[PDB]
Each structure stands twice: as structure tokens, then as C-alpha cells.
């Protein structure tokens, strides 16, 4: 009663795309590994660990407005990358697109004058502003360096950094 | 190293061992829907145990120098008739990863893959334990029956094993 | 500065959440009556809570340069069925507080005044809290009945609630 | 599941376990009544630890949903010749103690049962253990002799072994 | 020095709480297979406390300078009809154990060993607690009833006598 | 007794097996620091010594079974090395070689019935484990960044930071 | 820096010193097989110490740019008639390391080799200790005899000599 139904099911698909999210970040990150780049693969996989908190989190929300969340079918993320440079460009759009749907969410929560619902994703505006200044910096560094062996191999020591971070 | 045969083997069981994590935490959420707290609290950290043996394998794997693959994880059923439901559901659930972990180890072995068969002993152990908790709980419904009553105190008693 | 309306609007909050205290202290007078004491600690509890959310209303009202107003408050009922009947009643009421806290919302919004808005960010945060925590009490109800022994076993649960 | 078959395997090994438990505290009992606490000492804790080996296999079948059973114990010999002997026939019962737990593993693994034969690495390993010991003791008594002075000395090892 | 008949009296009383230990552990069992696991742990506790009953008794046997003897032990009851009678069983149990305790120290008076019969206050004292103990059991099995929600009652507070 | 005399004759030949890798990876190392890579000489030094104690834990194992561990004549490891790299890809293969006669001793500890023996074995099961994802990395590495000075200057950092781990 | 010769030298030493400590290490499950747990237990602790002495050896002759090569190590005798062959085996060969080690202190000075005349000074004292160390253990041979008895006493000191 809490939440209308039209927004459970936003929620919902923000829930499972979030899921999906995770997935393909920690896909991502085995084939760092498989590729020899440990710190990217140690930075991926920490960054599936967090996503996998942000559709944790709105899961509890919407189980705490009395609606029931809901898990559909997680696709089977992307495995095969031709470049670790490719990975992080797929990830920087993956994330424009993360920071899209919150941002329709949000709207859609205001116009409809759910304040709680536009107050609980005021946490993800937030992070999702954070992200994108971290993953332009990973592009930026290779931008800076290119993306010749040696230029992988520090990138790969500086991705090593942040994931301790 | 690994044959891709055993990779392949392997690669289930991690999309298997995704997959319960996913049905403990949407049973996790019907429990929550319907007031049962405590099964709810219980069910979640078993969702994360769940996630944590997912993860063992998946770095087992990538640690041999073979690629895990997640693939897609079937969808998890999220409505059930009764508490009792979900724990019988959970039991039989349980039964069938204990079996899927022993044939693992059967074909480990049945090839000498004797890494693999050392790795997933500590799986072997855990579905022991696994089984006397589960069937535990259905004999608790089995003693005091699944009324209203009934349901509240076998609800106390999950929040209680949940916190541990 | 609050516009006129904006200040009236939240004097009348102020006044709700006043008597909200004073219906929610009058049930637990039933109840210890009724010997729930488990049911009146909480109840005791959540009225003290909501003459904080008073408090913290009339204190921004103040803060803002304008008067905040106590009006008169009405004798809350003290006559109920049943320990069901009280806490459906809370959880109706709450529901209440809620809608009314969102109009607030809504018009400070709607009047672009984004310090008012910010403010009662509190409260409609508060209110999901709220709600979950009523609606769990009418579902252990539901789930044990209303019967001598039921009631027993939920008082126990109000009281640790409680603390 | 464990098979009814393994279920019996188990059962009659948890009978051999107090069995050996039992030998081990009446040959204690020789021991000291021959005045050889060190000796005694030793086998005392022997027991105890034999009776550990007993409930621990116990509860693994409880807990795999089966029901252990404790059969009749035979009486344990309670009449030997000399302290060496009692340690020549603990070393030779050690060594059956070995060679079924070893079976037991055989069919463990040969039913495919994964879970038990997993169950019994802890009990392999014990076994390792408790043969460098007893032969320890075998080679003690083959250096020194078993006149009076050897034995006294002897025993003094055992106390220390037992600490 | 120990008469030849006492030492006889002691090592039948060894024998007896051997088996009475055997019989606590095997109805442990029967607790666990039927999901009892308070009783279990009850049981399973009390079924130690009666080997350690044993042991003293051995111990005091060896120290007076003669030979306890280990006989055979029995196989206990391992079919039970419910929890109740399991513990019906052991309160009875427990009198007989009682009522040959009392037999051991009249014995020992009359021989005029006061020796043993100073050693047998122990397990005097001892009895006087059990009966107590396991008089209480029955006293809540008769007052709550062996339906399902009376029996998971009862077993969390054996869980919690056994803590 | 507790040993078959083939078990034991195997467990033997592991051990002098085991010996001669210790003293190669030994050699390797003063290859290592002869040539200025101090990095990897203080990792092969370090690896060498953790081959001493597999090799010793064999040894005890052998004479807590009752049987006489018995020590050969050490082979003289190979001293002079083309490069870094092929050090480091004689060790990868040597280390594949280990593991592999593990591997074969599990399989006759086991088909045997030698519970006890296929029980100790398993610490160098998981043991060789690690030790193949820890040599073919340092191989990822010279593949990426080649094997320049430069490059190699590099390498031999990482080699002296895994050395202290 | 080093001669060529020096090289030579201090390489055959280094191989040597490896022999030496699997020569104590053989000789200590000799000890253990036939019961001599003290005993055993001394000689293990000798073949570490001893493999030590290689090492610095070994690290010293890194240091001073040469390359040190191991050589392959001779095969240990691994039987004895009995106890007192052990630790009568164990005096002559630590005599030999100390006569070895005077020799090339001699060869170090006479080739104004002042650098490796120094390194050689702590080997130089620590033979010194060794040699009042293993004559001690034949001292009490002597004394007690060789008998089963006096095996088990003797056995017990080396216990003791191997706590410290």
C-alpha cells in the first residue's frame, strides 16, 4: 500500500538489472584474471561485490514498504573481451546507463509523489555520481598511457591500488 | 590442467550454487512479507553462505587457469502456500546439491583429478552439516504441526539460529 | 521566510502529532488496565517518541523566525474493544500521519520552499519506519489470534520491542 | 542417506571402539596393580581418548539421520603375564583398530559415499599417530630389557608420554 | 584391606554404572533420531556425568590395593514407545541405582569398613540431587501434557538443564 | 608394516625428487643475482627453501610410518641460463613436472589401498595447486611486458615484492 | 675479486657443508627407525645448523661476484651397526670439516686473500665447538659402555643436548 504498483515493478526491474550488474562485472573480472591482469581483476570483482550491495539495498527497501521484491532470470553476462581497454569502456557505459535508470527512477518516484521512494534513492544519486568520476579516470589513464603492454601493466598496478582503497 | 569436461562440470555447479543463493533470498522475502522474522533472518544468511560457496568454486576455477563461466541463473520461485512449504522446499533443495556435490567428486576422482577431489571436500563436509539443520526443522514442524501458534514459535526459534 | 500558509500548515502538524502522543499514552493506559503491560511499555514508548517529532517540528517552525502555535488538543479515545482493536487503530493512525506528513512534503515542494521540503525529509524517512514496524505487529495478530493465550505471547513481544 | 549396509559397518565399529576403551582401562588396572602408575597413567588416557573415538563416530551416524547402536561389550582380558606383554597386545590391537578403519574407508569410498570417507580421513590420520607411538614403546622395552630396573624406568617414560 | 565380598559389591557397582551410562547414550539417541536434541544433550551430558560415577568407584577399588574388574556389559533398550517413557525409564533407573547405593553403604557399615563407607557418601549426596533432578521431568511431562507443542516445550528446557 | 616396500620405495624417490628441486631452484637463484636480478634471486631463494620443506615433511612422514626415508646422491643442477625468462619457464615446466609425480603417487597411495599415504598426500595436492597459478603468472607478466631491460627491470621488482609476501 | 682457484675452493666447501647436513639428517632416521628419539632428535638439529653453514658460504661467494655451484651431493651412508658407530662417524667427520676449514684459511692468507681470511673466522670458531661437543658424546660412551641400558641414558642426554 506503501509503494504503488506501477512503482514495485520499477523497483523490481531496477533490482534485477542491478543483479545482472554485478554479474557482469564479476564475469569481467575472470577474464582479467584469465588475461594476467590481477589488479584489474582484483578491482572488478570488488566493484561486483559493492553492486551486488546497491540491489541488496533496494531489495530490503521494498520488502520494508510491504511489497513483495522480486528475482527474475539473471542473464548470462558477456565473457568473451577482445582488450582489457574494451572492458573498462564497457564498464564506464554500463554505468552511464546504471546512473540513466536512477535517475528515471527518481523522477518517476517525484512525479508520482512517492517522497519516501524519491527520499531512498537519493543514496544511489549520490554513488552512481561517485562512480562515473572513478571509471572516466581508469579511460583517462588509458587515454594517457595507451595500451601497449607495458602501459597495461601499470594500469593493471594501479587498478591493484584502488581496489584496496 | 583441468579437462574441459571437469570445467564444464564445474561451471554448473557454480550457476547451480548462484541460483540457491537466489531461491534462499526470494524465500527469504516471502517469509518477510508474510511476518515470519525470524525464518526470514535465517533464510538470508543462508542466501550469503550460499554466495560465499559460489565464490570458493568460481576462484577455484579461475586459480587453475580455466575460465568460469556464470552463465544465466534460472529464476527462483517467489510464492509458497505455507512457512512449511518453504522449509520442506529448502530440505529437498539442500538433498539435490548434496548429491550434485557428490557426483563432482565421483567424476573428480573417476578421472584422478585428485585437486579437484581435494577441493571439493570441504563442499562434501558442508552439505553433512547442511542436512542435519534442515531436517531439523521439519521435524520441529512435524512435532508442533503448522497452525498459527505452532508457526510463531518455529519462527522464534530461526531468528535464534539465524544469530550464529 | 515561511509563507502565511506554510505556517499554518505546519502548526496543524504540530498539533496532530501532539494529539498523536496524547492518543498513543491513553492506549497504554488501556492496556496496562487490561494487564498488557508489555503493550503499554511500547505504546508508552512510541509516545514519547511522538512528542519528540513534535518537538522537533515546533522547534523548526521557531528556527525559521515564525510562531509555532499549540492549539487545543482534543481528549483522545479511551475506550477500546480489545488489544486488536488498539493496535489496528495505531496502525490506521500511523497510516494517517504518513498521508498527512506527504501533503506537507508535497506543498513545500509545490511552493518551492526547498529549506521546508529538506526538513521533513526526516519525517517521511521516519514514517517508512514506522509503518513497517505497525503493520509486523497487525501480522503477529493475525498469525496467533486474539485469544487469552495469543495475547500473552504478543504482550511478551510488545515489551521487548520496547527496549 | 547412509546405506543400511555402511550403518552397520559403523555400528559394529563404534561397538570395537568401547571395546578397545574398556581393554585399555582394565589393563590400566593391571598396571597399577602391579605398580606401574606410569604405565597406568598412559592407558588411563588411552581409554578416555578410545572412548572419544567412540563418541565421535556415534555421533556422525546421528547425525546423518541413522541410529547408532551400542551392542553388548564383551569383558576385556583382565589377566596378563607382564607390563611388556600388556603393550605388545595394545600395539597388536592398535594395529586391528587400523586395518578396520581402513576397511571402513574402503567401503566408504567403493559405495561412493563420499561423505563418510571424508568423515574417516580424521580417523586415518589418528591412526598414523597412535602406531609411531605404541611402537615407541615396543622399541623401549626391546633396548632395555624388561628385568626390574628397565620396567622402572620404562614407567617413568609412560607418565611423562601421558603428561 | 578390602573384604573379598566387598570388592565383589564394588565391581558389580562399577558394572552397573557402566551399563547405566551405555543406557543414558543410547537414549540419547533415540532423542536425536526423533528430534529431541534438548533431550539428546540431556541425556547425552548425564550419560558422562555416570561414567565419571564409574571411574571414581574404579579408582577407589584400585587404591585400596585390590583389582576392579570390568565385566561384560549388556546391551541397553534402544527401542523406546516416546519421550515420556524415556524418561519414566531413567527416573526408575536412577531409584534402582539409588536403592544399591543404600545397599553398598548398609554393606560397608555392617562390615564395619568405614573406609568405603566414607567413599560411598559421596555417591549418597550424589543420588539425593538426581532424584530431584529427575523427578522434576516427570513433574513437567504430567503437568504440561506429550502432545507435539507440549514435548517441544520440554525439550528446550532439557536443552537448558543440560547448559 | 604401515607402508607397502613399493610405497615406501616411491615416497623415496619423491623425496630425492624433491632435494634436487630445492638445490636447482637454488642454483637458479645465484643465476638470478649473478646476472643483478636480486628480485627474483631472493624469490627462487625463498622458493628453494619451501621445496627443502616439502621435501622434509615427506621425510618425516616416511619414518613415522616405520620405514627408513632414504636420502641418494643429489644430480648437480643446471647452472648457466640464457635469460631471466628462460629461468623462470624451466621452473614453470619443472613445477608442471612435480605436480604431475604428486599426482602419480596419489594415484598408487590410492589404488593400493594406502588410505594413510592418499591422506598425507593431499597437503601437496593443494600445495602444487597454488604453485602453477604463481609460476604461470610471473609467465603472464614477461609475455606482457616483453622481455627488454627495461621490462625486465620491472619483472624483477614484482619478484622481489612476492618474494616478502 | 676471488681467484679462480679461491672459487674452486669455496664451492667444494659449500658442497661439502651440503653433504655434511644430509649426513646427519640420514643419520638421524637411522636414529629414530631404531628408537633413538634423543639421538634423533640431536642430529636433526645438526643437519639444520649445518645447512646454514652452507648458506652463508654460499651467499658469500655471491657476494664477492663469483657464482657458487652446487655440485651434486654424495650419497649418505644410511646403516650403522649401532649407536656408538653413529656418534663415532659424526666425531671423525666434523674433525675432517675442521681440518677442511684450516686449509682454506691457509690458502686465504697465503694468496693475501685477507676478505675470505676473515669471512673464514666464524667457521674457524664455531669448530672449535663442535669438536668439544661430539668428543663429549664419546666421553660418555666410554664411560657407561654401549649396553641397551646405557644406550637409553645416553639417548636421553642427546634429548637434552637438542633443547638448546
Redesign the interface.
Known amino acids: 500500500?506503501?509503494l504503488s504498483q506501477a512503482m514495485v515493478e520499477h523497483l523490481n526491474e531496477q533490482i534485477n538489472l542491478e543483479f545482472f550488474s554485478s554479474?557482469l562485472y564479476?564475469?569481467m573480472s575472470?577474464?582479467c584474471?584469465?588475461?594476467?591482469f590481477?589488479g584489474a581483476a582484483e578491482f572488478l570483482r570488488a566493484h561486483a561485490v559493492e553492486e551486488m550491495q546497491h540491489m541488496q539495498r533496494l531489495?530490503t527497501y521494498v520488502?520494508?514498504?510491504?511489497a513483495?521484491?522480486?528475482?527474475?532470470?539473471?542473464?548470462?553476462?558477456r565473457?568473451d573481451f577482445a582488450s582489457l581497454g574494451e572492458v573498462f569502456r564497457e564498464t564506464y557505459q554500463h554505468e552511464q546507463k546504471i546512473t540513466q535508470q536512477i535517475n528515471k527512477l527518481a523522477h518517476v518516484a517525484f512525479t508520482s509523489?512517492d517522497?519516501?521512494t524519491f527520499?531512498?534513492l537519493q543514496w544511489y544519486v549520490a554513488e552512481q555520481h561517485e562512480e562515473e568520476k572513478l571509471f572516466k579516470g581508469i579511460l583517462d589513464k588509458l587515454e594517457l598511457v595507451g595500451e601497449d603492454?607495458?602501459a597495461?601493466?601499470f594500469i593493471d598496478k594501479d587498478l591493484a591500488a584502488l581496489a584496496k582503497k
Do not use: C, V
Open positions: 500500500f506503501m554479474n564479476l564475469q575472470a577474464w584474471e584469465d588475461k594476467g590481477d531489495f520488502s520494508e514498504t510491504g513483495l521484491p522480486i528475482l527474475g532470470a539473471i542473464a548470462a553476462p565473457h509523489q517522497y519516501s527520499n531512498f603492454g607495458k597495461l601493466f
